[PDB]
């Protein structure tokens, strides 16, 4: 099935469109591309510095009426910079403004902490630590909910929260709205099993990031294991007959998660989205989930001392 119901009662796309990295000059044209081959589901999010130009694909594709507006599933995410009750409605009407839309479908707490506001996405103090806010996870949760009040979002969620911060959300004392969605990396080498367990229990979706390793992503050493030159993943790929990131793809399909590959490479969107087609084996599942190793894109390396920084908990 494409998609999966949430606790919304809304229906989001397992399938998605990513855009981190995606450079203003190409992500127009990519999402273009993507809403052309089949994908319903974009996810964005102010900090990529590109919503404007995504918006400017979504908005041409219901001009020419290839979609119509219920039939996409667009994602952000609020900021750290934005934890602030008085910021959040203002942060979220830009990221309307610049998508070009009247309300987004998932709006995602994008990480736990909380940063200085102000112009910097990364405020640092003189010796290089980012500056915190003061403001806690559920103040930023009562401000995500009355976007949903005010009809700016259709369900909110959380991103990069670990099994100890959906709890705290869960157990916020007057919660009113239940996060929809935890967005978090997930791959062969992070397979996530007690976060992913944790949140299917208490009927939030999970959405896998990074699925393909991001070999991309600005950080990458020479010498880091890569998903998509393993030759264990090739061998699976090429007994169905699949592509190595056609497996990626499909392996958190199978573990009923949503999953958000990132490509700007026309022939490789529609490539990723030719996973309805095929099934990997339970025995297929197992040895891919026997890969993992603990290996993140996504440490937020510079925020290890963040009260809420949330990588030091198992899970
Ligand atoms: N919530 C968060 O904190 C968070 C953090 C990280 C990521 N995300 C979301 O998750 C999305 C996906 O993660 P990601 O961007 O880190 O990385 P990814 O999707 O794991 O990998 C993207 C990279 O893989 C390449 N690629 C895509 N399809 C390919 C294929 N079929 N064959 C070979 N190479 C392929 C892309 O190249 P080309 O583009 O050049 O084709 C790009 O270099 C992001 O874009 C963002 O939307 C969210
Ligand atoms: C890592 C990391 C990043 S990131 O790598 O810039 C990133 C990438 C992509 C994205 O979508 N979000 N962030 O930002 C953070 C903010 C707070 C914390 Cl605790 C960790 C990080």
Redesign the pocket.
């Given at each position: 099935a494409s998609r999966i119901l949430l606790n919304n009662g809304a229906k989001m796309p397992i399938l998605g469109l990513g855009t981190?990295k995606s450079p203003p000059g190409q992500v127009t044209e990519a999402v273009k591309v993507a809403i052309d081959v089949g994908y319903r589901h974009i996810d964005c999010?102010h900090?990529?510095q590109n919503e404007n130009e995504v918006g400017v694909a979504i908005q041409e594709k219901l001009r020419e009426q290839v979609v119509k507006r219920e039939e996409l599933f667009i994602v952000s995410?609020l900021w750290?910079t934005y934890h602030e009750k008085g910021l959040v409605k203002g942060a979220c009407q830009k990221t309307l403004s610049d998508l070009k839309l009247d309300y987004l479908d998932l709006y995602l707490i994008?990480?736990?902490?909380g940063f200085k506001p102000g112009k910097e996405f990364?405020p640092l103090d003189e010796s290089g630590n980012?500056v915190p806010s003061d403001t806690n996870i559920l103040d930023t949760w009562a401000a995500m909910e009355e976007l949903v009040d005010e009809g700016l979002v259709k369900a909110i969620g959380i991103?990069?929260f670990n099994h100890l911060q959906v709890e705290m959300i869960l157990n916020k004392p007057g919660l009113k709205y239940k996060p929809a969605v935890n967005q978090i990396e997930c791959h062969p080498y992070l397979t996530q099993e007690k976060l992913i367990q944790y949140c299917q229990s208490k009927g939030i979706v999970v959405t896998a990031?990074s699925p393909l390793g991001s070999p991309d992503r600005p950080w990458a050493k020479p010498e880091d294991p890569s998903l998509l030159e393993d030759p264990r993943i090739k061998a699976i790929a090429a007994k169905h007959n699949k592509t190595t990131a056609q497996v990626l793809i499909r392996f958190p399909m199978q573990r009923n998660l949503v999953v958000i590959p990132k490509s700007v490479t026309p022939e490789r969107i529609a490539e990723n989205f030719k996973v309805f087609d095929f099934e990997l084996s339970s025995q297929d599942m197992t040895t891919l989930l026997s890969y993992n190793r603990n290996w993140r894109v996504?440490?937020?390396?510079?925020?290890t001392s963040?009260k809420?920084?949330?990588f030091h908990e198992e899970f």
């Open positions: 981190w999010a900090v990529y995410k750290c994008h990480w736990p902490t990364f980012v991103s990069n990031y996504c440490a937020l390396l510079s925020c963040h809420d920084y949330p």
